[PDB]
Amino acid sequence: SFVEMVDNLRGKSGQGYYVEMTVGSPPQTLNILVDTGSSNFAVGAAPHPFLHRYYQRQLSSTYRDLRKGVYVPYTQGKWEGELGTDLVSIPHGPNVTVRANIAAITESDKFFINGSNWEGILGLAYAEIARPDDSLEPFFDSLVKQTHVPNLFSLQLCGASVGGSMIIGGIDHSLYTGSLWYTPIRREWYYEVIIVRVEINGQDLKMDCKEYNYDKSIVDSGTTNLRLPKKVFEAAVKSIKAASSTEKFPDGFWLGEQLVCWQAGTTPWNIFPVISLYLMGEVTNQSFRITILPQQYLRPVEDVATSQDDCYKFAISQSSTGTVMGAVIMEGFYVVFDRARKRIGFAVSACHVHDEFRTAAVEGPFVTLDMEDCGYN
Ligand SMILES: CC(C)c1cccc(CNC[C@@H](O)[C@@H]2Cc3cccc(c3)OCCCCCC(=O)N(C)[C@@H](C)C(=O)N2)c1
């Protein structure tokens, strides 16, 4: 019965992927951002300029106040509110209702996005990073404990205005091609993984693999860009700059500020390199790689002037809190969050990014010695 969840995600480019949910009795419908980079389920619960609707606790006969405050600071944006519980369902999801923790957002700062069409956020990571502390059980833990939904979910994030699928409880084989390749979840807090090698156009960056995971590497559907530690970011940009030097870009382009444009249909994709990320595998000295096309890390953006040229934003930014494999990395892959077996699977998505001569890929096996040494401690 996973067909009922195919195409249950929508969104606008760069404004996150969201799924429809209901909270309370009678059910109040809200669009909820799908975020594997945090662990709090929170919804707008007070008027806000960018909110078209919000959770009205007074109108829910099943609402229970927990008499406890909460706030969450993200990398960008934050909110505060009041903790409580209520009945929650996913219309295009499993046919179940669960009582879950809900943070009623009463105040926020640079969190909600004008015209995003979502009113809350579903943190799908583990209790260890929940606010105010790990005793506040995350939504997915409650779903698994209260129903028979198996302890895993899979995400198919599709590019172009955007759509995708969140399969709750399993793997839908109609959403991918080829083989699934699995990397261990290093520790159950974020979805933490270990990157063991990085290549750009087949050239090894030749860095200490610890640099790739300093101070951690996570799979984060709630972050748009690929975010890289300072030293790795500098090496990647230098390599990407050289490969595309036949064209000039403003320096602000490489910072994610300015947007580059070309005549409609003349974007020179061939001058931008592919990025291969090698992930620790399931067996001794074995890794696998996922290859990222430039159509993934050059996010298309609405032409500020006369919409007559294809314009893009550089979707790779610098990080001071480790590597983030964000939405642009996940797009075109089918990513399986196999919580039950502490692993994350990758396969080419059925909605894969199309280049003419190159293709996004998930390939293995590879031999990589000393993979354990790549984890930061
Ligand atoms: C909460 C704790 C556990 C924590 C602290 C710091 C970092 C993390 C890692 N995970 C971050 C995500 O949880 C967050 C979600 C989030 C917050 C606000 C808006 C969101 C998603 O959608 C809008 C779509 C556009 C996304 C733009 C974008 O890339 N962002 C807004 C990044 C910068 C980010 O901050 N996204 C987790």
UniProtKB/Swiss-Prot annotation:
Residues 1-377 are extracellular. Its main location: membrane. GO terms for molecular function: amyloid-beta binding; aspartic-type endopeptidase activity; beta-aspartyl-peptidase activity; endopeptidase activity; enzyme binding; peptidase activity; protein serine/threonine kinase binding. The keyword Phosphoprotein applies. It is a single-pass type I membrane protein. Changing residue 215 to N: Almost abolishes beta-cleaved soluble APP production. One of its GO terms (biological process) is cellular response to manganese ion. The modification N6-acetyllysine is found at residues 68, 206, 210, 216, 230-231, 238. Disulfide bonds join 158-351, 209-374, 261-311. Residues 17-347 form the Peptidase A1 domain. It catalyses: Broad endopeptidase specificity. Cleaves Glu-Val-Asn-Leu-|-Asp-Ala-Glu-Phe in the Swedish variant of Alzheimer's amyloid precursor protein. The active site is at residues 35, 220. The keyword DNA damage does not apply. Expressed at high levels in the brain and pancreas. In the brain, expression is highest in the substantia nigra, locus coruleus and medulla oblongata. Glycans are attached at residues 95, 114, 285. It is found in: Cell membrane; Golgi apparatus, trans-Golgi network; Endoplasmic reticulum; Endosome. Belongs to the peptidase A1 family. This is Beta-secretase 1. It comes from Homo sapiens.
